[PDB]
Amino acid sequence: VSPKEILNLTSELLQKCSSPAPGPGKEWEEYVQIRTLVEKIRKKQKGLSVTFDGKREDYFPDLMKWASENGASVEGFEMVNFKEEGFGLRATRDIKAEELFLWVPRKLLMTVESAKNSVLGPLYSQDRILQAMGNIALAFHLLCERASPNSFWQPYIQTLPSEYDTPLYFEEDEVRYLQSTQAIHDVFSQYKNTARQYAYFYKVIQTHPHANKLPLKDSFTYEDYRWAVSSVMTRQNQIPTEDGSRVTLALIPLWDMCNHTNGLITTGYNLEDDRCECVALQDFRAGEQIYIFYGTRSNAEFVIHSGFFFDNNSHDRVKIKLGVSKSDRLYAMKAEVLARAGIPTSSVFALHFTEPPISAQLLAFLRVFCMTEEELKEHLLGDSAIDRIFTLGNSEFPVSWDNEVKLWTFLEDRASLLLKTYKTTIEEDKSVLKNHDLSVRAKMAIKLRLGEKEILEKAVKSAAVNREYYRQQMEEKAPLPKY
Amino acid sequence: TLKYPIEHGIVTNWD
Ligand SMILES: Nc1ncnc2c1ncn2[C@@H]1O[C@H](CSCC[C@H](N)C(=O)O)[C@@H](O)[C@H]1O
């Protein structure tokens, strides 16, 4: 055990994680190589630098007292360790839908601004990564205050979780389930980014005089950094600055204990009283868990950045990359039509599970992608060209029956091809889930890969139905809708 | 409308 050996290992980790991508065909090998080095460092370290003697629930009364003294709502709910979601809020009285039941004044928040005014200030003013990335700044703000026994935010920090279910905590064999999916590339990136950032800041803290007064100067472990970035990614929020002219990132105590259910966003910032405010998403009877709607994120985003998979996520989606090929004889015209419509020539679009499967922007792209030369000219020239562009994203106004048949044929074939790039089938995934006993983290990975394929399969079916509908219109010579 | 809706755990870039 010596600081010189850790210094050698973090320098090696920094060089490893600063190399360019080796190509997608070797990203798994790179991932396992980085994991091996991270685990060697982690085994030579002492876990979290600061731990607390009490149990998590021992500190919730201090959280309530502290939040109360600073103007937050503390009546009408209690914290309960639920099996499905972990700790959350439970109503102790009936709460009506749309009732303002939770509010948190700005003084309680941890923000990039409070990070700047903290012991981290001097190093923040020097390091270009901290100034550019408020989320990393929040993460170091958390660590510095965690290790400061007299911190104003100790009541909040002592009630935070000590572990998360972000992919940073997954075993190698749990991530292995995601081989061949879209999501695993984001898992790879998160792991490499996090390891690179840990090694970079480890060296920066050692060399920068502005870091001399930080507790991190005496102890800063990989576990510290993984915990801090996972705390921030699973709980951070965008709020306006005090003057309302800019946005900043913040952790919001007490309210961020609410778990997620489907619905609408009911939390907003009140500038006049300078506090976060939450109205009830639905009626909550006494004894019922209080939920909020986190946002319209996909299950890939919930797994990677929030650490959970949400069954019956009505906003689930997968990505699909499309572009006009520069070998297309009509490339120049198609690119100009797309540019006039505000759509890039190449982009990553979404396929949605809830109807409709494609957005107005993807419909517009696909229509132009399949246009004939005569149709392109009608979107480029003359007194109706602008009108024709205006309707490109509108399912009710096709370019022509032929254009629709072609684009839905294309999407059906592409979604089918994408399904064929996965290592397992939908039926195999359901069999794994039914016949094996798995961890929470393993189930998150398998449900994620199942969900990608189920969205693609629904897209194939919806494109096939649409192809048949427009082929009927074409064969019946139906008059084209005119806007 | 909510003038400043708060998305819990809004995704940020860590690259
Ligand atoms: N519907 C849901 N199902 C499962 N876990 C959920 C959930 N909504 C929220 N979570 C969990 O809650 C975290 C967000 S912070 C919410 C409070 C948290 N349960 C705690 O004990 O501090 C997520 O990272 C995930 O672990």
Author numbering:
A (entry chain A): 19 to 501
B (entry chain Y): 66 to 80
Q: What's the publication's text?
A:
Here we elucidate the structural and molecular determinant(s) of target specificity of histidine vs. lysine in the active site of SETD3. On the substrate-binding surface, the residues are diverse, reflecting the fact that the three enzymes act on three very distinct substrates—the large subunit of Rubisco by LSMT, RelA subunit of nuclear factor NFκB by SETD6, and actin by SETD3—with limited sequence similarity immediately surrounding the methylation target. To facilitate the methyl transfer reaction, SETD3 provides a local environment that promotes deprotonation of the target nitrogen N3 of histidine (and concomitant protonation of N1). Most (if not all) SAM-dependent MTases use the classic SN2 reaction mechanism, which requires the target nitrogen be in a deprotonated state.
Third, to verify that the target histidine, before and after the methyl transfer reaction, can adopt two different conformations in the active site, we reduced the concentration of SAM in the reaction, which resulted in a mixture of methylated and unmethylated peptides, and followed with crystallization. Indeed, the active-site density for the histidine residue can be modeled by two ring conformations with a rotation of ~105°, whereas the conformations of residues lining the active-site pocket remain unchanged. The position of the target N3 atom and its relative distance to the cofactor in the two conformations are virtually identical. We think the primary reason for the rotation is to switch the proton from N3-H to N1-H, ensuring the target atom N3 is deprotonated prior to the methyl transfer. As a result, the deprotonated N3 nitrogen carrying a lone pair of electrons attacks, in a nucleophilic manner, the positively charged methylsulfonium of SAM.
